[PDB]
Amino acid sequence: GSMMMALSKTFGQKPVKFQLEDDGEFYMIGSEVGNYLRMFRGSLYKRYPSLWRRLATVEERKKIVASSHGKKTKPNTKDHGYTTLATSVTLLKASEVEEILDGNDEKYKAVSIS
C-alpha cells in the first residue's frame, strides 16, 4: 500500500535569468536551460518549437554577464570578468522556462497542439 508518484524534469541549480526590460521582463540563457534539462544539439529548440528563443546583442550580452552572472565558479579574477560566453547568448522567456520547470509546456513542445 505505497502510493508511487514523483516527477523529475529539472536537474541542478536553476538556469541564469536576467532582466532585459524595465517592465520586469525576465529572460534565461538557453545554454543554461539546455544543460539544466540535459538537452543538446538544439534538442531544446527542436523539442520546443513554441518556445520563445532569440539572440542577444553585444550590449545585451554585456548586461547579461553583469546582470545575470557575476563571479561564477572555477578560477576567476576580480580585475577581469567573462569574455567567452559573450560571443553568442540565447535568451528565452522566463515564463516559458518557468512553465516547463513547473511541468507545464505541452504547448511549447508541440507548438500549440490545439
Swiss-Prot record:
Chain spans, region DNA-binding: 3-114
Domain of life: Eukaryota
Cross-link Glycyl lysine isopeptide (Lys-Gly) (interchain with G-Cter in SUMO2) per UniProt, renumbered positions: K107, K109
Effect of R38H: In CSS3; uncertain significance
Residue stretches in coiled coil: none
Compartments where located: Nucleus
Function in brief: Core component of the BAF (hSWI/SNF) complex. This ATP-dependent chromatin-remodeling complex plays important roles in cell proliferation and differentiation, in cellular antiviral activities and inhibition of tumor formation. The BAF complex is able to create a stable, altered form of chromatin that constrains fewer negative supercoils than normal. This change in supercoiling would be due to the conversion of up to one-half of the nucleosomes on polynucleosomal arrays into asymmetric structures, termed altosomes, each composed of 2 histones octamers.
Subunit structure: Component of the multiprotein chromatin-remodeling complexes SWI/SNF: SWI/SNF-A (BAF), SWI/SNF-B (PBAF) and related complexes. The canonical complex contains a catalytic subunit (either SMARCA4/BRG1/BAF190A or SMARCA2/BRM/BAF190B) and at least SMARCE1, ACTL6A/BAF53, SMARCC1/BAF155, SMARCC2/BAF170, and SMARCB1/SNF5/BAF47. Other subunits specific to each of the complexes may also be present permitting several possible combinations developmentally and tissue specific. (Microbial infection) Binds tightly to the human immunodeficiency virus-type 1 (HIV-1) integrase in vitro and stimulates its DNA-joining activity. Interacts with human papillomavirus 18 E1 protein to stimulate its viral replication. Interacts with Epstein-Barr virus protein EBNA-2.
Domain comment, as recorded: The N-terminal DNA-binding region is structurally similar to winged helix domains.
Sequence similarity: Belongs to the SNF5 family.
Clinical condition linked: Rhabdoid tumor predisposition syndrome 1: A familial cancer syndrome predisposing to renal or extrarenal malignant rhabdoid tumors and to a variety of tumors of the central nervous system, including choroid plexus carcinoma, medulloblastoma, and central primitive neuroectodermal tumors. Rhabdoid tumors are the most aggressive and lethal malignancies occurring in early childhood.
Record's protein name: SWI/SNF-related matrix-associated actin-dependent regulator of chromatin subfamily B member 1
Source organism (scientific name): Homo sapiens (Human)
Lineage, highest ranks first: Eukaryota, Metazoa, Chordata, Craniata, Vertebrata
Encoding gene, per UniProt annotation: SMARCB1
